[PDB]
Amino acid sequence: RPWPASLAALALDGKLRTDSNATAAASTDFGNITSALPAAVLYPSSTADLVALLSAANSTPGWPYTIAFRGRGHSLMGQAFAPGGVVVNMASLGDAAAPPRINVSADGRYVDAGGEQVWIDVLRASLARGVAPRSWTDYLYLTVGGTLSNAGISGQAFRHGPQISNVLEMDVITGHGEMVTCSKQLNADLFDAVLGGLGQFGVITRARIAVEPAPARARWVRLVYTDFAAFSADQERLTAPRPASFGPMSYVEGSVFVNQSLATDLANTGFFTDADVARIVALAGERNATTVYSIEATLNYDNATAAAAAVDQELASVLGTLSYVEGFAFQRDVAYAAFLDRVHGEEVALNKLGLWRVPHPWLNMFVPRSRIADFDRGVFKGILQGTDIVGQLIVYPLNKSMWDDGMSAATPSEDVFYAVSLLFSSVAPNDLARLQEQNRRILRFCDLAGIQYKTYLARHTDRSDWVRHFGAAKWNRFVEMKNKYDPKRLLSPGQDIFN
Numbered sequence: 148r149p150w151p152a153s154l155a156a157l158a159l160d161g162k163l164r165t166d167s168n169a170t171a172a173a174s175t176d177f178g179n180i181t182s183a184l185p186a187a188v189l190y191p192s193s194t195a196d197l198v199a200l201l202s203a204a205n206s207t208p209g210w211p212y213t214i215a216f217r218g219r220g221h222s223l224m225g226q227a228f229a230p231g232g233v234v235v236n237m238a239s240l241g242d243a244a245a246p247p248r249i250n251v252s253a254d255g256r257y258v259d260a261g262g263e264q265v266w267i268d269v270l271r272a273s274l275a276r277g278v279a280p281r282s283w284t285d286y287l288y289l290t291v292g293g294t295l296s297n298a299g300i301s302g303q304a305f306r307h308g309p310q311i312s313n314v315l316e317m318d319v320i321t322g323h324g325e326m327v328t329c330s331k332q333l334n335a336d337l338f339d340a341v342l343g344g345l346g347q348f349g350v351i352t353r354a355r356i357a358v359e360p361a362p363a364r365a366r367w368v369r370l371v372y373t374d375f376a377a378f379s380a381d382q383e384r385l386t387a388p389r390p391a392s393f394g395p396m397s398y399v400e401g402s403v404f405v406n407q408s409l410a411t412d413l414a415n416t417g418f419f420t421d422a423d424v425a426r427i428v429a430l431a432g433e434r435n436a437t438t439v440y441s442i443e444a445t446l447n448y449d450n451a452t453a454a455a456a457a458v459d460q461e462l463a464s465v466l467g468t469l470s471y472v473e474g475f476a477f478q479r480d481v482a483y484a485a486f487l488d489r490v491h492g493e494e495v496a497l498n499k500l501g502l503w504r505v506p507h508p509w510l511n512m513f514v515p516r517s518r519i520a521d522f523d524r525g526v527f528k529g530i531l532q533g534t535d536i537v538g539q540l541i542v543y544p545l546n547k548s549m550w551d552d553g554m555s556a557a558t559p560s561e562d563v564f565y566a567v568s569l570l571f572s573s574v575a576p577n578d579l580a581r582l583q584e585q586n587r588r589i590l591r592f593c594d595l596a597g598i599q600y601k602t603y604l605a606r607h608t609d610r611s612d613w614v615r616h617f618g619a620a621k622w623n624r625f626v627e628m629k630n631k632y633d634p635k636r637l638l639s640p641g642q643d644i645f646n
């Protein structure tokens with residue numbers, strides 16, 4: 148039962164809290180489906196406080212508290228909880244002012260960011276110094292440590308790889324309470340374990356993120372299809388490596404619209420005008436389509452005098468290689484930061500309607516390219532038909548060559564695989580249960596069809612499921628690494644890997 152001086156010091160300084168207000172805030176997440184109250188919440192003011200907790204945890208025999216690192220609690224199924232344990236309120240690391248938590252290098256080649264920092268702030272501190280990270284998430288209010296413990300994907304990942312592929316080095320406090328600086332050169336076994344590591348090996352206090360010169364603007368396009376074969380062939384053409392080298396597109400994503408909610412979902416993009424919506428709805432009726440697909444792509448560009456006309460010509464050449472329905476190219480032109488933060492607006496709009504802090508039974512997965520047409524038929528044209536869709540259905544290809552298989556993040560074996568993100572929002576408890584059963588049905592459809600998919604952002608509750616997730620050989624490596632960095636099995640228990 149005794150406490151080390153540094154641990155008891157945190158209680159004394161009002162950093163380690165047990166009050167109902169502190170525990171309740173760290174007991175819910177974005178998912179809004181599961182909840183688990185912690186025994187205590189840590190609000191650290193420095194990384195020494197994280198060393199204190201973790202050294203205490205490693206030195207104290209029979210220590211009973213599990214420890215989680217709450218980024219912004221964007222988790223869907225309690226991955227950031229420490230049931231009857233200690234939740235770290237990471238955001239407290241950036242409360243002071245001195246020293247700054249985000250530092251762009253003097254050479255403009257990278258950005259050092261605190262593990263707790265949010266990407267929108269990383270973007271602002273980078274843009275002030277004329278640079279910006281190269282690989283994003285669709286939504287910017289997530290933590291560096293949180294996205295890096297998953298993968299971090301968006302429409303730039305086909306050409307720059309996920310966020311985990313754009314990290315030069317990190318400062319990690321292991322489950323032993325040891326401060327370790329790691330990279331591909333120094334303690335690479337920890338660096339690889341942590342990236343896509345689901346917070347199992349230690350906490351990321353600093354990450355060195357690759358940057359590129361900041362473009363000023365984004366020419367933003369949406370291309371419409373009624374044929375899945377043409378839509379997927381075009382997303383693959385736009386993202387294909389040209390014989391290490393890529394095409395002109397800075398970002399490529401896509402979306403599916405089911406016939407039943409077509410006009411409403413197109414209008415809810417925040418992209419199409421009512422005149423654009425009417426034309427697409429009419430197109431669907433002419434082709435007798437039960438689904439409509441849209442490619443979403445950008446072309447990043449600088450403030451140059453000729454830039455605008457050069458972009459028009461470059462975009463026109465790219466579009467001429469494509470097979471979208473003639474006359475169904477829709478363009479917008481925005482400032483680069485506005486494109487990157489396009490989702491914050493959706494968060495604000497939904498929150499005031501009371502439609503943001505609702506259950507999110509999201510289904511996110513990686514589907515091998517060879518089975519995407521089967522997934523489209525069984526899911527978009529099958530299971531989802533005749534349902535009212537509240538949310539987005541995002542589908543886009545990724546290049547495996549840009550993913551490091553030695554890292555923890557699990558991906559399909561094929562060269563090309565699609566990110567498939569089914570972002571359902573629940574409208575009622577009976578709608579929640581219906582949505583949770585529908586997600587089980589989609590996964591069952593994939594299993595019965597022999598689709599070798601990988602989930603993303605999901606936590607498995609069975610050992611056999613986590614072994615199948617990583618793959619048996621890659622699983623043994625994840626175990627070896629757990630035994631090295633968290634032998635007491637306390638870190639991020641909400642993943643249900645070792646807890």
Ligand SMILES: *Cc1cc2c(cc1C)nc1c(=O)[nH]c(=O)nc-1n2C[C@H](O)[C@H](O)[C@H](O)COP(=O)(O)OP(=O)(O)OC[C@H]1O[C@@H](n2cnc3c(N)ncnc32)[C@H](O)[C@@H]1O
Nearest residue numbers: 216218219220221222262285290292293299300346351639
């Ligand atoms: C809510 C949401 C999430 C989201 C998204 C849009 C919204 C509205 N768009 C995404 C996208 O386009 N691409 C992508 O890859 N992910 C996207 N997400 C999911 C997001 O990555 C996850 O929610 C993720 O967990 C990041 O969120 P957060 O920063 O809020 O992290 P957490 O949920 O609290 O914790 C996740 C796990 O990681 C461990 N953790 C957290 N911080 C650290 C640090 N610094 N070091 C080590 N481990 C850490 C937690 O313990 C937990 O297990």
Ligand SMILES: *[C@@H]1O[C@H](CO)[C@@H](O[C@@H]2O[C@H](CO)[C@@H](O)[C@H](O)[C@H]2NC(C)=O)[C@H](O)[C@H]1NC(C)=O
Nearest residue numbers: 405406407408409410431432434435436437438
């Ligand atoms: C797409 O969905 C619409 C409904 O939003 C279908 O249009 C309806 O068709 C039914 C039966 O054929 C009629 O009873 C309704 O009066 C129609 N309602 C509207 C608002 O048009 C349409 O058939 C669907 N198309 C496909 C190809 O499935």
Ligand SMILES: CC(C)=CCNc1ncnc2[nH]cnc12
Nearest residue numbers: 285286300490493511539568570
């Ligand atoms: C991988 C993942 C969860 C992407 C989410 N992307 C998103 N993309 C666009 N709008 C959104 N609203 C919520 N999430 C949105």
Ligand SMILES: *[C@@H]1O[C@H](CO)[C@@H](O)[C@H](O)[C@H]1NC(C)=O
Nearest residue numbers: 175176179180181182504505
């Ligand atoms: C879901 O969010 C609502 C609104 O904040 C709240 O009533 C409820 O406790 C949440 N449920 C879970 C399981 O987090």
Ligand SMILES: *[C@@H]1O[C@H](CO)[C@@H](O)[C@H](O)[C@H]1NC(C)=O
Nearest residue numbers: 406432434435436437438528
């Ligand atoms: C329109 O498509 C539907 C559903 O996909 C099919 O059942 C129907 O027979 C079609 N109509 C024609 C004229 O092909």
